Amino acid sequence: GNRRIRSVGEMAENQFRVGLVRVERAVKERLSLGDLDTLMPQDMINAKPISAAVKEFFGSSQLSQFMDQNNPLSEITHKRRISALGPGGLTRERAGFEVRDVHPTHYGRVCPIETPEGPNIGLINSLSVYAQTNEYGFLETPYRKVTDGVVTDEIHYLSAIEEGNYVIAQANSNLDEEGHFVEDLVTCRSKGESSLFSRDQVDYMDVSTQQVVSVGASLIPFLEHDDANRALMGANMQRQAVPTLRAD
């Protein structure tokens, strides 16, 4: 809830604004002293600073990356990537362990088992499968609203701070007859931690069992029987697989 997402449209809007003030200063200077009857807008508006700034951004920013194109999973995981570095963000050499950890609010917004395994480990993340943004840029994930024990099919996208108030059921909790829970002491998570709760106290439920993991981490069969250190490397190494002669 303290870290929003500054995407490509916002970044290119800001670089356009930088080029626009860099040319607005000069056109105000020209309009201050120049002639008036024959002064067109065309010869005083110069397309050099705006195009130069936006081409500099799109060609050589720290977030304008040469796309990985090994397989389709490589490109789609690159296009759903989240970088803590860049202009305005952190730096790789002077980041501690606290920014490189799995915060409990990553449940459903950021994958905990897909990241690089070098000096880039907590600083490059991956968007989860159902994760969205707000209009403000905070990550949100969908939940099914339960009412009087009846888990409905109404879907609410809860942001990072809104879900910290309610008790949200696990997706591995049992349902029947499109009704209610089959047990009383049901697991839930609330205010960070995760403890046992009653079957009527619950406020929400996860929309699916693959809500936590990303795209590439949800192609691994029997992922729940894997250690996380090896599941991370499997999700990494799927993106380096060359396409062979006959698909299988």
Partner 1 sequence: GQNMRVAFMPWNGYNFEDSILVSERVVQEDRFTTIHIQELACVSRDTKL
Partner 2 sequence: DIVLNPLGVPSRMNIGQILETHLGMAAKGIGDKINAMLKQQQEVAKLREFIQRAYDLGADVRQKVDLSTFSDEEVMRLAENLRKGMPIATPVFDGAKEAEIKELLKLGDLPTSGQIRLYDGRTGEQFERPVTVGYMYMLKLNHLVDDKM
Partner 3 sequence: EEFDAIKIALASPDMIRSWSFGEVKKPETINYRTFKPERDGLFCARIFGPVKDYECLCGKYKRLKHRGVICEKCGVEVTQTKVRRERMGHIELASPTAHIWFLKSLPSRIGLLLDMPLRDIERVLYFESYVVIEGGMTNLERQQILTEEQYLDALEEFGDEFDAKMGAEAIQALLKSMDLEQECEQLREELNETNSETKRKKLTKRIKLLEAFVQSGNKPEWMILTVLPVLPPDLRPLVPLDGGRFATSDLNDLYRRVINRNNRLKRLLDLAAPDIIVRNEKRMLQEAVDALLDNGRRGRAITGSNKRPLKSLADMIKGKQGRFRQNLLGKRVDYSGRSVITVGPYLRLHQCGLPKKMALELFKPFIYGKLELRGLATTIKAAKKMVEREEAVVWDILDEVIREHPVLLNRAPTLHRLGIQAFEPVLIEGKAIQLHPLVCAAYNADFDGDQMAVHVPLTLEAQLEARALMMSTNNILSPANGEPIIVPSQDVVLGLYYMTRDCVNAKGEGMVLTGPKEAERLYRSGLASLHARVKVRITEYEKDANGELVAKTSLKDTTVGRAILWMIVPKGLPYSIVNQALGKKAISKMLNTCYRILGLKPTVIFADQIMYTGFAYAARSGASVGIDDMVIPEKKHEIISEAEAEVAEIQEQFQSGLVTAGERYNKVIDIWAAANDRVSKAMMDNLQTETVINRDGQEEKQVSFNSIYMMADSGARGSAAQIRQLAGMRGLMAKPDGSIIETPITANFREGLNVLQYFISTHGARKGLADTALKTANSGYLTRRLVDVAQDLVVTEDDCGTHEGIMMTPVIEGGDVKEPLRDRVLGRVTAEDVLKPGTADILVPRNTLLHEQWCDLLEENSVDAVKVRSVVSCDTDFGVCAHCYGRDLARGHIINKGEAIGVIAAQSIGEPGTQLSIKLSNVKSVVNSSGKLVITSRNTELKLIDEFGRTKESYKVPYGAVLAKGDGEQVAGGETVANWDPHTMPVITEVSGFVRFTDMIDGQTITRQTDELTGLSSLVVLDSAERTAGGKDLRPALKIVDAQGNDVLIPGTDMPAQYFLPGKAIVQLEDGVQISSGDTLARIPQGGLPRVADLFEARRPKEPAILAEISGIVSFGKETKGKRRLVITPVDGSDPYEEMIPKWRQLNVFEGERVERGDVISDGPEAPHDILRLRGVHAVTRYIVNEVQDVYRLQGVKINDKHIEVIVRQMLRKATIVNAGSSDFLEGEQVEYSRVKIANRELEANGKVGATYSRDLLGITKASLATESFISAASFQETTRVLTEAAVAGKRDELRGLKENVIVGRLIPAGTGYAYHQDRMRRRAAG
Q: Name the minimum Å distance from CB 100 to RNA.
A: 14
Q: How far apart are CA 40 and CA 37, in angstroms?
A: 8
Buried b (16+ CB within 10 A) or exposed e, 61-81: eeeeeeebeeeebbeebeebb
Q: How far apart are CA 15 and CA 64, in angstroms?
A: 13
Q: Which residue has the tokens 């356009």?
A: 16
236 is an interface residue for RNA by CB under 7 A: yes
Pair of tokens at residue 188: 């839930």
When CB distances are held under 5 to 8 angstroms depending on the partner's kind, the choice from RNA, partner 3, partner 1, none that residue 206 binds is partner 3
Q: Name the minimum Å distance from CB 210 to partner 3.
A: 9
Q: How far apart are CA 88 and CA 171, in angstroms?
A: 37
Q: Name the minimum Å distance from CB 246 to partner 1.
A: 8
Nearer to partner 2, 107 or 138 (CB): 107
Q: Name the minimum Å distance from CB 79 to partner 2.
A: 19
88 is an interface residue for RNA by CB under 7 A: no
Q: Name the minimum Å distance from CB 25 to partner 3.
A: 19
Q: Which residue, 169, 130, 131, 129, is CA-closest to 151?
A: 169
Instruction: List binders of partner 1 among 214-243 (CB under 8 A).
Output: 241-243
Of residues 83, 132, 173, 187, which one binds RNA by CB under 7 A? 83
Nearer to partner 3, 27 or 85 (CB): 85
Cβ within 8 Å of residue 13, ≥6 positions away:
none
Q: How far apart are CA 125 and CA 236, in angstroms?
A: 12
Contact residues: partner 1, CB under 8 A: 241-246, 248
Contact residues: partner 3, CB under 8 A: 97, 100-103, 107, 112-113, 115, 117-119, 121-122, 170-172, 187, 189, 193-196, 206, 209, 211-212, 222-229, 232
